[PDB]
């Protein structure tokens, strides 16, 4: 089997991408944030505290003839940005782009943190990291991909995120018309539960490529590119007037600037992020200070190849017995 679904930016900045997901019988379609940095499929629901729902579409398990409460199971998650959610668990039928999994754990939120309530466009998350990170207790549950992978034509999914435009998540096949050149594959460590890999270095604009190992994670659920402070300083030094602002929370730059590109290495291959992809717009409405799309990871503990980087590539998440990642230009 295969599946193919369009993923759409939630706003004009590509802050996140939403993909429609069918849950239950009859289907209830919710728009979920596919997140290769986490491993829970959780949704706003009829059980979510009413004051914490503000415009999201909810899953109502009592209206699904295939829903079954997973007795005794609870979940609770905290994300790298400080947000969180928790609740109970059903199993139900879940379909993405024509690919159907029966008995998928659907984690129904009883509580969500304010950042989720305040984003009416995201009805939940669909985790695509390794199932070892799934938070369901006392019996950990499998991700949608893990449940589907034996049925897929090939045990892969691909992320083809758009810049200011829709893109595609495919399951079970590699669309050879969706990228240019060849896909360069690179090793993955699953020791932390992430799609963790080592970039071979970087360049700023038309500058020389610096060969240096940068360990980080491919994370569709993180908006920006978080890299070591040395690399980030080298980038922003090429933008007149850019500076790190402690009060704003990162590098800002004059909105009048033209940003240079940023290149990252995948083996001997090179992925070029155009400068425009690094512009996240005014820090507040009407400001002439703009927020940068490349930021320091120093306060995180891990480098994160988020959407800024991934949207410049066609990305293969190869879930073979020994997983690997593939990157192509497009």
UniProtKB/Swiss-Prot annotation:
The active site is at residues 35, 199. GO terms for biological process: proteolysis. The keyword Disulfide bond applies. Keywords: Aspartyl protease, Disulfide bond, Hydrolase, Protease, Signal, Zymogen. Its EC number is 3.4.23.22. The keyword Disulfide bond applies. GO terms for molecular function: aspartic-type endopeptidase activity. It comes from the Eukaryota. It catalyses: Hydrolysis of proteins with specificity similar to that of pepsin A, prefers hydrophobic residues at P1 and P1', but does not cleave 14-Ala-|-Leu-15 in the B chain of insulin or Z-Glu-Tyr. Clots milk. Residues 17-328 form the Peptidase A1 domain. Disulfide bonds join 255-290. Belongs to the peptidase A1 family. This is Endothiapepsin. It comes from Cryphonectria parasitica.
